[PDB]
Amino acid sequence: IQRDIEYSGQYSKDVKLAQKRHKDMNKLKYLMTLLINNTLPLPAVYKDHPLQGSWKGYRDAHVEPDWILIYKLTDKLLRFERTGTQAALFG
């Protein structure tokens, strides 16, 4: 068993929008690299935690106070699911 890396179609759109809105993409890249490299658990600054409701099975890390990464992590997969504001991702 080797864990894969996945990106939802929506994730790619979300990343393009973050770029367009002048977010500091290096901050998202750093977080993604920690996950990809299995340098886990993440440090406390990300406030990483599991989600419920429609996002049950996924996790929530804060890149910034209003910039969230939603991802799934199992033994088999790491999937980057969405990124953006809390309102966009949860509202």
Short mmCIF file of N, CA and C in Angstrom, two decimals:
data_model
loop_
_atom_site.label_atom_id
_atom_site.label_comp_id
_atom_site.label_asym_id
_atom_site.label_seq_id
_atom_site.Cartn_x
_atom_site.Cartn_y
_atom_site.Cartn_z
N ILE A 1 0.81 -1.21 0.00
CA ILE A 1 0.00 0.00 0.00
C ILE A 1 0.85 1.27 0.00
N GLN A 2 0.70 2.07 -1.05
CA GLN A 2 1.34 3.38 -1.10
C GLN A 2 0.26 4.44 -1.17
N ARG A 3 0.34 5.42 -0.28
CA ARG A 3 -0.61 6.53 -0.28
C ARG A 3 -0.42 7.40 -1.52
N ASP A 4 -1.52 7.76 -2.16
CA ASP A 4 -1.46 8.57 -3.36
C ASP A 4 -1.61 10.06 -3.07
N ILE A 5 -1.62 10.88 -4.10
CA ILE A 5 -1.93 12.29 -3.93
C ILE A 5 -3.01 12.60 -4.93
N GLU A 6 -4.08 13.24 -4.47
CA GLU A 6 -5.20 13.56 -5.35
C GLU A 6 -5.60 15.02 -5.23
N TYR A 7 -6.12 15.57 -6.32
CA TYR A 7 -6.63 16.93 -6.35
C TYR A 7 -8.00 16.89 -6.98
N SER A 8 -9.04 17.31 -6.26
CA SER A 8 -10.36 17.37 -6.87
C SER A 8 -10.36 18.39 -8.00
N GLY A 9 -11.30 18.24 -8.93
CA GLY A 9 -11.45 19.24 -9.98
C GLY A 9 -11.72 20.61 -9.39
N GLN A 10 -12.54 20.66 -8.35
CA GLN A 10 -12.84 21.93 -7.70
C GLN A 10 -11.59 22.56 -7.08
N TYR A 11 -10.69 21.73 -6.54
CA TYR A 11 -9.48 22.26 -5.92
C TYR A 11 -8.67 23.10 -6.89
N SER A 12 -8.53 22.61 -8.12
CA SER A 12 -7.77 23.34 -9.12
C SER A 12 -8.39 24.70 -9.42
N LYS A 13 -9.72 24.75 -9.49
CA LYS A 13 -10.42 26.01 -9.70
C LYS A 13 -10.18 26.93 -8.50
N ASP A 14 -10.27 26.37 -7.30
CA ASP A 14 -10.05 27.14 -6.08
C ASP A 14 -8.65 27.76 -6.03
N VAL A 15 -7.64 27.00 -6.45
CA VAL A 15 -6.27 27.48 -6.45
C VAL A 15 -6.11 28.64 -7.43
N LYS A 16 -6.71 28.51 -8.62
CA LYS A 16 -6.66 29.60 -9.59
C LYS A 16 -7.31 30.87 -9.05
N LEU A 17 -8.43 30.72 -8.34
CA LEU A 17 -9.13 31.87 -7.79
C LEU A 17 -8.30 32.55 -6.70
N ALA A 18 -7.65 31.76 -5.85
CA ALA A 18 -6.77 32.30 -4.81
C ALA A 18 -5.65 33.11 -5.44
N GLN A 19 -5.09 32.58 -6.52
CA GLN A 19 -4.04 33.30 -7.25
C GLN A 19 -4.56 34.64 -7.76
N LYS A 20 -5.73 34.61 -8.39
CA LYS A 20 -6.37 35.80 -8.95
C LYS A 20 -6.64 36.84 -7.87
N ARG A 21 -6.99 36.39 -6.67
CA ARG A 21 -7.32 37.30 -5.58
C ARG A 21 -6.11 37.72 -4.76
N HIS A 22 -4.92 37.37 -5.24
CA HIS A 22 -3.64 37.82 -4.70
C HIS A 22 -3.31 37.23 -3.34
N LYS A 23 -3.79 36.02 -3.08
CA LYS A 23 -3.37 35.32 -1.87
C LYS A 23 -1.89 34.94 -1.96
N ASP A 24 -1.25 34.81 -0.80
CA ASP A 24 0.14 34.39 -0.73
C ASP A 24 0.23 32.88 -0.96
N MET A 25 0.46 32.48 -2.21
CA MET A 25 0.36 31.08 -2.57
C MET A 25 1.44 30.23 -1.92
N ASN A 26 2.56 30.85 -1.57
CA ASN A 26 3.60 30.12 -0.86
C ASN A 26 3.11 29.54 0.47
N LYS A 27 2.17 30.21 1.13
CA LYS A 27 1.64 29.69 2.39
C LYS A 27 0.85 28.40 2.18
N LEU A 28 0.07 28.36 1.11
CA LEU A 28 -0.70 27.16 0.81
C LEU A 28 0.24 26.04 0.37
N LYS A 29 1.23 26.39 -0.46
CA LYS A 29 2.19 25.40 -0.93
C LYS A 29 2.95 24.76 0.23
N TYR A 30 3.32 25.55 1.23
CA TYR A 30 4.08 25.01 2.36
C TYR A 30 3.26 23.97 3.11
N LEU A 31 2.00 24.30 3.36
CA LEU A 31 1.08 23.38 4.03
C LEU A 31 0.89 22.11 3.21
N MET A 32 0.64 22.27 1.91
CA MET A 32 0.48 21.12 1.03
C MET A 32 1.70 20.21 1.06
N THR A 33 2.89 20.81 1.07
CA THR A 33 4.12 20.02 1.08
C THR A 33 4.25 19.20 2.37
N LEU A 34 3.87 19.77 3.50
CA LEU A 34 3.91 19.02 4.76
C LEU A 34 3.01 17.79 4.68
N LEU A 35 1.81 17.97 4.13
CA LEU A 35 0.88 16.85 3.96
C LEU A 35 1.42 15.80 2.98
N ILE A 36 1.89 16.26 1.82
CA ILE A 36 2.42 15.36 0.80
C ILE A 36 3.59 14.54 1.35
N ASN A 37 4.45 15.19 2.13
CA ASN A 37 5.64 14.52 2.68
C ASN A 37 5.37 13.71 3.94
N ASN A 38 4.11 13.70 4.40
CA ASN A 38 3.74 13.00 5.64
C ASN A 38 4.51 13.53 6.85
N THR A 39 4.78 14.84 6.84
CA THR A 39 5.44 15.51 7.96
C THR A 39 4.35 15.90 8.97
N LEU A 40 3.79 14.87 9.60
CA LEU A 40 2.57 14.97 10.40
C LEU A 40 2.79 14.34 11.78
N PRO A 41 2.10 14.86 12.82
CA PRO A 41 1.07 15.90 12.77
C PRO A 41 1.55 17.31 12.42
N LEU A 42 0.65 18.05 11.77
CA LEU A 42 0.88 19.45 11.44
C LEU A 42 1.12 20.27 12.70
N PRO A 43 1.88 21.35 12.57
CA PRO A 43 2.05 22.21 13.75
C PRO A 43 0.75 22.91 14.13
N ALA A 44 0.70 23.35 15.39
CA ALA A 44 -0.51 23.88 15.99
C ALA A 44 -1.07 25.10 15.27
N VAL A 45 -0.21 25.89 14.62
CA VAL A 45 -0.64 27.13 13.98
C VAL A 45 -1.73 26.89 12.93
N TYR A 46 -1.78 25.69 12.36
CA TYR A 46 -2.80 25.38 11.35
C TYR A 46 -4.17 25.05 11.93
N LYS A 47 -4.26 24.84 13.24
CA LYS A 47 -5.53 24.53 13.90
C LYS A 47 -6.25 23.37 13.20
N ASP A 48 -5.47 22.37 12.81
CA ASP A 48 -5.99 21.26 12.04
C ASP A 48 -7.00 20.44 12.83
N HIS A 49 -8.12 20.10 12.19
CA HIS A 49 -9.16 19.33 12.87
C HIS A 49 -10.11 18.66 11.88
N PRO A 50 -10.78 17.58 12.32
CA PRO A 50 -11.75 16.91 11.44
C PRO A 50 -13.03 17.72 11.30
N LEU A 51 -13.74 17.48 10.20
CA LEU A 51 -15.00 18.16 9.93
C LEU A 51 -16.19 17.20 10.03
N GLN A 52 -17.37 17.77 10.19
CA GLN A 52 -18.62 17.01 10.23
C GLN A 52 -19.62 17.54 9.22
N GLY A 53 -20.88 17.09 9.33
CA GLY A 53 -21.90 17.53 8.39
C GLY A 53 -21.56 17.10 6.97
N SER A 54 -21.78 18.00 6.01
CA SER A 54 -21.52 17.71 4.61
C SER A 54 -20.05 17.38 4.35
N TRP A 55 -19.17 17.79 5.26
CA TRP A 55 -17.73 17.55 5.10
C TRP A 55 -17.20 16.42 5.97
N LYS A 56 -18.09 15.58 6.48
CA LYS A 56 -17.69 14.42 7.26
C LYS A 56 -16.67 13.58 6.48
N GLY A 57 -15.61 13.15 7.16
CA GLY A 57 -14.55 12.39 6.52
C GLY A 57 -13.37 13.23 6.07
N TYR A 58 -13.57 14.55 6.03
CA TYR A 58 -12.52 15.50 5.63
C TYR A 58 -11.96 16.24 6.85
N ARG A 59 -10.90 17.02 6.61
CA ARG A 59 -10.25 17.82 7.64
C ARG A 59 -10.11 19.27 7.17
N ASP A 60 -9.89 20.16 8.13
CA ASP A 60 -9.87 21.61 7.95
C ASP A 60 -8.57 22.12 8.55
N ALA A 61 -7.70 22.71 7.72
CA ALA A 61 -6.53 23.43 8.24
C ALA A 61 -6.61 24.89 7.82
N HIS A 62 -6.21 25.79 8.71
CA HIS A 62 -6.23 27.21 8.39
C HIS A 62 -4.88 27.65 7.83
N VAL A 63 -4.86 28.08 6.57
CA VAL A 63 -3.67 28.71 6.01
C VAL A 63 -3.52 30.11 6.63
N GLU A 64 -4.66 30.79 6.78
CA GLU A 64 -4.76 32.12 7.39
C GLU A 64 -6.10 32.16 8.11
N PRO A 65 -6.39 33.22 8.89
CA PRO A 65 -7.66 33.17 9.63
C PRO A 65 -8.91 32.97 8.76
N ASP A 66 -8.90 33.49 7.54
CA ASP A 66 -10.02 33.26 6.63
C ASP A 66 -9.56 32.65 5.31
N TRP A 67 -8.59 31.75 5.39
CA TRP A 67 -8.19 30.95 4.23
C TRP A 67 -8.01 29.53 4.71
N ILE A 68 -8.93 28.66 4.28
CA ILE A 68 -9.03 27.28 4.74
C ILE A 68 -8.61 26.33 3.64
N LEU A 69 -7.97 25.23 4.03
CA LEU A 69 -7.77 24.08 3.16
C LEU A 69 -8.61 22.93 3.70
N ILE A 70 -9.48 22.38 2.85
CA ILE A 70 -10.22 21.16 3.17
C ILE A 70 -9.56 20.01 2.40
N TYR A 71 -9.19 18.97 3.12
CA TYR A 71 -8.51 17.83 2.53
C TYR A 71 -8.96 16.53 3.21
N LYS A 72 -8.70 15.40 2.56
CA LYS A 72 -8.96 14.10 3.17
C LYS A 72 -7.65 13.36 3.30
N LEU A 73 -7.44 12.70 4.43
CA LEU A 73 -6.24 11.92 4.64
C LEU A 73 -6.57 10.57 5.26
N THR A 74 -6.30 9.51 4.50
CA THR A 74 -6.38 8.15 5.01
C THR A 74 -5.03 7.46 4.79
N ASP A 75 -4.94 6.18 5.14
CA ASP A 75 -3.71 5.44 4.88
C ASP A 75 -3.47 5.28 3.38
N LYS A 76 -4.55 5.34 2.60
CA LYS A 76 -4.50 5.10 1.16
C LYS A 76 -4.41 6.36 0.32
N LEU A 77 -4.91 7.48 0.83
CA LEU A 77 -4.97 8.66 -0.02
C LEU A 77 -4.79 9.97 0.73
N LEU A 78 -4.20 10.93 0.04
CA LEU A 78 -4.26 12.32 0.46
C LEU A 78 -4.97 13.05 -0.66
N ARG A 79 -6.10 13.67 -0.36
CA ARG A 79 -6.87 14.36 -1.39
C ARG A 79 -7.10 15.82 -1.02
N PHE A 80 -6.56 16.72 -1.84
CA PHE A 80 -6.83 18.14 -1.69
C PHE A 80 -8.19 18.45 -2.29
N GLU A 81 -9.12 18.91 -1.46
CA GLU A 81 -10.53 18.98 -1.86
C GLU A 81 -11.03 20.37 -2.23
N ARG A 82 -10.85 21.34 -1.33
CA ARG A 82 -11.22 22.73 -1.59
C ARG A 82 -10.28 23.66 -0.86
N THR A 83 -10.18 24.89 -1.35
CA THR A 83 -9.52 25.94 -0.59
C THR A 83 -10.19 27.29 -0.85
N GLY A 84 -10.29 28.12 0.19
CA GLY A 84 -10.92 29.42 0.05
C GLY A 84 -11.35 29.95 1.40
N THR A 85 -12.28 30.89 1.38
CA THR A 85 -12.79 31.47 2.61
C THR A 85 -13.70 30.48 3.32
N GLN A 86 -13.93 30.72 4.61
CA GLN A 86 -14.87 29.91 5.35
C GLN A 86 -16.27 30.00 4.74
N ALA A 87 -16.67 31.20 4.33
CA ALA A 87 -17.98 31.40 3.73
C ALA A 87 -18.14 30.61 2.44
N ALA A 88 -17.12 30.64 1.58
CA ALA A 88 -17.19 29.93 0.31
C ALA A 88 -17.27 28.42 0.50
N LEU A 89 -16.51 27.91 1.46
CA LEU A 89 -16.36 26.47 1.63
C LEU A 89 -17.48 25.85 2.47
N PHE A 90 -18.05 26.63 3.39
CA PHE A 90 -19.03 26.08 4.32
C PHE A 90 -20.42 26.69 4.22
N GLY A 91 -20.53 27.92 3.74
CA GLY A 91 -21.81 28.62 3.78
C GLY A 91 -22.89 27.97 2.95
#
